[PDB]
Design a protein around this ligand. Structure first.
Ligand SMILES: O=c1ccn([C@@H]2O[C@H](COP(=O)(O)OP(=O)(O)O)[C@@H](O)[C@H]2O)c(=O)[nH]1
Ligand SMILES: O[C@@H]1[C@@H](O)[C@H](O[C@@H]2CO[C@@H](O)[C@H](O)[C@H]2O)OC[C@H]1O
Ligand SMILES: [Mn+2]
Length: 238
Protein backbone atom coordinates (compact mmCIF):
# COMPACT_ATOMS: atom_id res chain seq x y z
CA UNK A 1 0.00 0.00 0.00
CA UNK A 2 0.83 3.77 -0.41
CA UNK A 3 2.21 6.15 2.31
CA UNK A 4 1.62 9.95 2.56
CA UNK A 5 4.21 12.38 3.94
CA UNK A 6 2.13 15.10 5.47
CA UNK A 7 4.41 18.14 5.18
CA UNK A 8 3.40 21.04 7.45
CA UNK A 9 5.35 24.28 7.02
CA UNK A 10 5.48 25.76 10.44
CA UNK A 11 6.54 28.70 12.57
CA UNK A 12 4.85 29.98 15.76
CA UNK A 13 1.64 27.92 15.41
CA UNK A 14 1.83 25.62 18.40
CA UNK A 15 -1.80 26.28 19.28
CA UNK A 16 -2.86 25.33 15.72
CA UNK A 17 -0.59 22.30 15.69
CA UNK A 18 -2.24 20.89 18.88
CA UNK A 19 -5.56 21.04 17.06
CA UNK A 20 -4.14 19.88 13.71
CA UNK A 21 -2.47 16.61 14.86
CA UNK A 22 -5.43 14.90 16.52
CA UNK A 23 -7.92 16.09 13.89
CA UNK A 24 -5.84 14.85 10.96
CA UNK A 25 -4.85 11.55 12.57
CA UNK A 26 -8.48 10.60 13.16
CA UNK A 27 -9.69 11.89 9.76
CA UNK A 28 -7.05 9.97 7.82
CA UNK A 29 -7.47 6.85 9.95
CA UNK A 30 -11.17 6.72 8.90
CA UNK A 31 -10.19 6.51 5.24
CA UNK A 32 -7.36 4.09 5.74
CA UNK A 33 -4.62 6.53 4.71
CA UNK A 34 -1.15 5.55 5.99
CA UNK A 35 0.85 8.70 6.72
CA UNK A 36 3.11 10.65 9.01
CA UNK A 37 3.21 14.26 10.02
CA UNK A 38 6.41 16.23 9.40
CA UNK A 39 6.46 19.64 11.06
CA UNK A 40 8.73 21.91 9.06
CA UNK A 41 9.81 24.34 11.76
CA UNK A 42 11.67 27.29 10.23
CA UNK A 43 14.25 28.29 12.87
CA UNK A 44 16.27 30.91 10.97
CA UNK A 45 15.25 34.57 11.27
CA UNK A 46 14.33 35.21 7.64
CA UNK A 47 10.74 35.80 6.57
CA UNK A 48 8.52 32.70 6.35
CA UNK A 49 9.36 30.59 3.28
CA UNK A 50 6.70 27.88 3.02
CA UNK A 51 7.78 26.60 -0.40
CA UNK A 52 11.44 26.15 0.55
CA UNK A 53 10.36 24.40 3.79
CA UNK A 54 8.35 21.98 1.67
CA UNK A 55 11.41 21.30 -0.52
CA UNK A 56 13.39 20.47 2.61
CA UNK A 57 10.67 18.21 4.02
CA UNK A 58 10.48 16.37 0.72
CA UNK A 59 14.25 15.71 0.73
CA UNK A 60 14.13 14.54 4.36
CA UNK A 61 11.21 12.23 3.94
CA UNK A 62 12.26 8.66 3.04
CA UNK A 63 11.34 6.94 -0.30
CA UNK A 64 8.71 4.93 1.54
CA UNK A 65 6.34 7.93 1.21
CA UNK A 66 5.35 7.75 -2.44
CA UNK A 67 3.32 10.91 -2.11
CA UNK A 68 3.21 14.10 -0.10
CA UNK A 69 0.58 16.46 1.15
CA UNK A 70 1.64 20.10 1.40
CA UNK A 71 -0.65 20.96 4.25
CA UNK A 72 -1.32 24.27 6.03
CA UNK A 73 -1.50 23.69 9.78
CA UNK A 74 -4.71 25.79 10.20
CA UNK A 75 -6.90 24.14 7.56
CA UNK A 76 -9.00 21.17 8.74
CA UNK A 77 -11.18 19.04 6.40
CA UNK A 78 -14.78 18.68 7.67
CA UNK A 79 -15.98 16.35 4.95
CA UNK A 80 -14.91 12.63 4.99
CA UNK A 81 -15.44 12.52 1.16
CA UNK A 82 -12.27 14.53 0.69
CA UNK A 83 -10.04 11.63 -0.22
CA UNK A 84 -6.34 12.10 0.58
CA UNK A 85 -5.60 9.35 -1.89
CA UNK A 86 -2.56 8.57 -4.06
CA UNK A 87 -2.91 11.07 -6.94
CA UNK A 88 -3.71 9.74 -10.45
CA UNK A 89 -1.24 9.81 -13.39
CA UNK A 90 -2.77 13.18 -14.39
CA UNK A 91 -0.97 15.17 -11.69
CA UNK A 92 -1.54 16.74 -8.26
CA UNK A 93 -4.73 16.16 -6.33
CA UNK A 94 -5.88 19.50 -4.93
CA UNK A 95 -7.92 18.91 -1.79
CA UNK A 96 -8.80 22.53 -1.00
CA UNK A 97 -10.34 23.49 -4.31
CA UNK A 98 -11.59 27.00 -5.30
CA UNK A 99 -15.25 25.89 -4.68
CA UNK A 100 -14.54 24.41 -1.24
CA UNK A 101 -11.98 26.81 0.24
CA UNK A 102 -13.44 29.40 2.70
CA UNK A 103 -11.41 32.26 1.28
CA UNK A 104 -9.68 31.61 -2.05
CA UNK A 105 -11.93 31.08 -5.08
CA UNK A 106 -10.05 31.68 -8.32
CA UNK A 107 -9.79 28.89 -10.89
CA UNK A 108 -6.14 27.93 -10.58
CA UNK A 109 -5.84 28.29 -6.84
CA UNK A 110 -3.81 25.30 -5.71
CA UNK A 111 -2.96 26.40 -2.15
CA UNK A 112 -4.02 25.23 1.30
CA UNK A 113 -3.78 21.43 0.85
CA UNK A 114 -2.09 19.94 -2.26
CA UNK A 115 -1.15 16.27 -2.81
CA UNK A 116 1.72 15.39 -5.18
CA UNK A 117 3.26 12.09 -6.21
CA UNK A 118 6.89 11.70 -5.30
CA UNK A 119 7.79 11.21 -8.98
CA UNK A 120 5.89 14.33 -10.14
CA UNK A 121 7.40 16.54 -7.42
CA UNK A 122 10.87 15.39 -8.63
CA UNK A 123 9.83 16.05 -12.25
CA UNK A 124 8.87 19.62 -11.48
CA UNK A 125 12.01 20.26 -9.44
CA UNK A 126 9.63 20.81 -6.50
CA UNK A 127 8.79 24.42 -5.53
CA UNK A 128 10.48 27.78 -6.17
CA UNK A 129 12.79 29.10 -3.37
CA UNK A 130 12.31 32.79 -4.09
CA UNK A 131 9.09 33.21 -2.07
CA UNK A 132 9.94 34.87 1.22
CA UNK A 133 6.79 35.96 3.05
CA UNK A 134 3.15 35.50 2.13
CA UNK A 135 1.83 34.90 -1.35
CA UNK A 136 2.49 33.65 -4.86
CA UNK A 137 4.52 30.47 -4.14
CA UNK A 138 1.52 28.21 -4.87
CA UNK A 139 0.63 30.07 -8.10
CA UNK A 140 4.18 29.71 -9.47
CA UNK A 141 3.86 26.00 -8.64
CA UNK A 142 0.61 25.86 -10.70
CA UNK A 143 2.71 26.96 -13.65
CA UNK A 144 5.33 24.33 -12.85
CA UNK A 145 2.43 21.86 -13.02
CA UNK A 146 1.32 22.96 -16.53
CA UNK A 147 4.93 23.24 -17.79
CA UNK A 148 5.49 19.64 -16.77
CA UNK A 149 2.56 18.52 -18.92
CA UNK A 150 0.62 17.75 -15.77
CA UNK A 151 -2.77 18.93 -14.54
CA UNK A 152 -4.74 19.39 -11.34
CA UNK A 153 -7.58 17.10 -10.33
CA UNK A 154 -9.98 17.84 -7.46
CA UNK A 155 -12.62 15.71 -5.65
CA UNK A 156 -15.88 15.40 -7.56
CA UNK A 157 -19.40 15.46 -6.22
CA UNK A 158 -18.55 17.15 -2.94
CA UNK A 159 -21.93 18.42 -1.72
CA UNK A 160 -20.56 20.92 0.89
CA UNK A 161 -19.02 24.14 -0.41
CA UNK A 162 -17.10 27.21 0.70
CA UNK A 163 -18.80 27.59 4.07
CA UNK A 164 -18.76 24.08 5.40
CA UNK A 165 -16.02 22.04 3.74
CA UNK A 166 -13.14 23.40 5.83
CA UNK A 167 -12.43 24.85 9.20
CA UNK A 168 -9.90 27.66 8.56
CA UNK A 169 -9.22 28.92 12.05
CA UNK A 170 -6.94 31.79 11.13
CA UNK A 171 -7.79 35.20 12.50
CA UNK A 172 -6.11 37.78 10.17
CA UNK A 173 -5.08 39.91 13.17
CA UNK A 174 -3.87 37.20 15.51
CA UNK A 175 -1.80 35.56 12.69
CA UNK A 176 -0.71 38.36 10.36
CA UNK A 177 0.04 37.54 6.78
CA UNK A 178 3.47 38.93 5.95
CA UNK A 179 2.62 40.96 2.85
CA UNK A 180 5.52 43.39 3.01
CA UNK A 181 7.49 44.11 -0.14
CA UNK A 182 11.04 45.44 -0.30
CA UNK A 183 13.90 45.47 -2.80
CA UNK A 184 12.47 44.43 -6.09
CA UNK A 185 10.16 41.78 -4.65
CA UNK A 186 6.91 42.59 -6.55
CA UNK A 187 8.63 42.53 -9.89
CA UNK A 188 10.73 39.44 -9.26
CA UNK A 189 8.36 37.10 -7.47
CA UNK A 190 5.65 37.70 -10.09
CA UNK A 191 7.79 36.06 -12.71
CA UNK A 192 8.20 32.31 -13.37
CA UNK A 193 11.30 30.94 -11.61
CA UNK A 194 13.17 28.45 -13.81
CA UNK A 195 16.37 28.77 -11.73
CA UNK A 196 15.64 27.39 -8.26
CA UNK A 197 13.92 24.45 -6.74
CA UNK A 198 14.29 21.20 -4.93
CA UNK A 199 17.74 20.69 -6.47
CA UNK A 200 19.38 23.78 -4.92
CA UNK A 201 17.42 24.81 -1.84
CA UNK A 202 20.17 25.80 0.61
CA UNK A 203 19.65 24.85 4.27
CA UNK A 204 20.63 22.75 7.30
CA UNK A 205 18.49 20.64 9.55
CA UNK A 206 19.90 21.64 12.93
CA UNK A 207 17.86 19.17 14.93
CA UNK A 208 15.29 16.42 14.43
CA UNK A 209 12.72 15.90 17.20
CA UNK A 210 10.45 12.89 17.73
CA UNK A 211 7.34 14.19 19.44
CA UNK A 212 4.18 12.39 20.70
CA UNK A 213 0.95 14.34 21.02
CA UNK A 214 -1.57 12.22 22.86
CA UNK A 215 0.22 9.07 21.61
CA UNK A 216 0.36 10.28 17.99
CA UNK A 217 3.96 10.30 16.72
CA UNK A 218 5.11 13.41 14.88
CA UNK A 219 8.50 14.49 13.49
CA UNK A 220 9.83 18.02 13.98
CA UNK A 221 12.43 19.40 11.57
CA UNK A 222 14.24 22.48 12.81
CA UNK A 223 15.23 23.97 9.45
CA UNK A 224 17.72 26.79 9.16
CA UNK A 225 17.06 28.17 5.70
CA UNK A 226 19.72 30.19 4.01
CA UNK A 227 19.33 33.42 2.11
CA UNK A 228 21.52 34.77 -0.68
CA UNK A 229 20.87 38.49 -0.48
CA UNK A 230 22.55 39.03 -3.84
CA UNK A 231 19.53 37.10 -5.31
CA UNK A 232 16.63 37.36 -2.80
CA UNK A 233 17.27 40.34 -0.46
CA UNK A 234 13.49 40.43 0.31
CA UNK A 235 14.09 37.45 2.59
CA UNK A 236 14.51 40.29 5.17
CA UNK A 237 12.95 43.75 4.99
CA UNK A 238 14.09 45.06 8.41
O1 LIG B 1 4.28 32.70 10.11
C1 LIG B 1 3.79 31.68 9.59
C2 LIG B 1 3.16 31.74 8.34
C3 LIG B 1 2.52 30.60 7.86
N1 LIG B 1 2.78 29.38 8.44
C4 LIG B 1 2.27 28.13 7.82
O2 LIG B 1 1.96 28.42 6.47
C5 LIG B 1 0.60 28.08 6.21
C6 LIG B 1 0.09 28.96 5.10
O3 LIG B 1 0.12 30.24 5.68
P1 LIG B 1 -1.21 31.18 5.79
O4 LIG B 1 -2.14 30.66 6.83
O5 LIG B 1 -0.83 32.57 6.08
O6 LIG B 1 -1.87 31.01 4.31
P2 LIG B 1 -3.41 31.37 3.92
O7 LIG B 1 -4.31 31.37 5.11
O8 LIG B 1 -3.41 32.75 3.33
O9 LIG B 1 -3.86 30.34 2.93
C7 LIG B 1 -0.04 28.30 7.59
O10 LIG B 1 -1.38 27.84 7.75
C8 LIG B 1 0.99 27.58 8.46
O11 LIG B 1 0.98 26.15 8.29
C9 LIG B 1 3.41 29.33 9.68
O12 LIG B 1 3.53 28.26 10.29
N2 LIG B 1 3.92 30.48 10.25
O1 LIG C 1 -0.38 32.61 -2.86
C1 LIG C 1 -1.76 32.85 -3.26
C2 LIG C 1 -1.89 34.26 -3.67
O2 LIG C 1 -0.87 34.58 -4.65
C3 LIG C 1 -3.36 34.54 -4.13
O3 LIG C 1 -3.59 35.85 -4.54
C4 LIG C 1 -4.59 35.86 -5.63
C5 LIG C 1 -3.87 35.63 -6.97
O4 LIG C 1 -4.76 35.80 -8.14
C6 LIG C 1 -5.43 37.13 -8.13
O5 LIG C 1 -6.45 37.12 -9.13
C7 LIG C 1 -6.01 37.64 -6.78
O6 LIG C 1 -5.93 39.09 -6.66
C8 LIG C 1 -5.42 37.09 -5.51
O7 LIG C 1 -6.46 36.86 -4.53
O8 LIG C 1 -4.36 34.24 -3.09
C9 LIG C 1 -4.19 32.85 -2.63
C10 LIG C 1 -2.74 32.56 -2.17
O9 LIG C 1 -2.65 31.24 -1.59
MN1 LIG D 1 -4.29 30.29 6.87
Amino acid sequence: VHKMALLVPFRDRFEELLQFVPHMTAFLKRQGVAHHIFVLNQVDRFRFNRASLINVGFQFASDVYDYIAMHDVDLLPLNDNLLYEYPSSLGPLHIAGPKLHPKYHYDNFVGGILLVRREHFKQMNGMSNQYWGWGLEDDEFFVRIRDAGLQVTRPQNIKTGTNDTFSHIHNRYHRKRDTQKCFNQKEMTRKRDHKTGLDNVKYKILKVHEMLIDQVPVTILNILLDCDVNKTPWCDCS
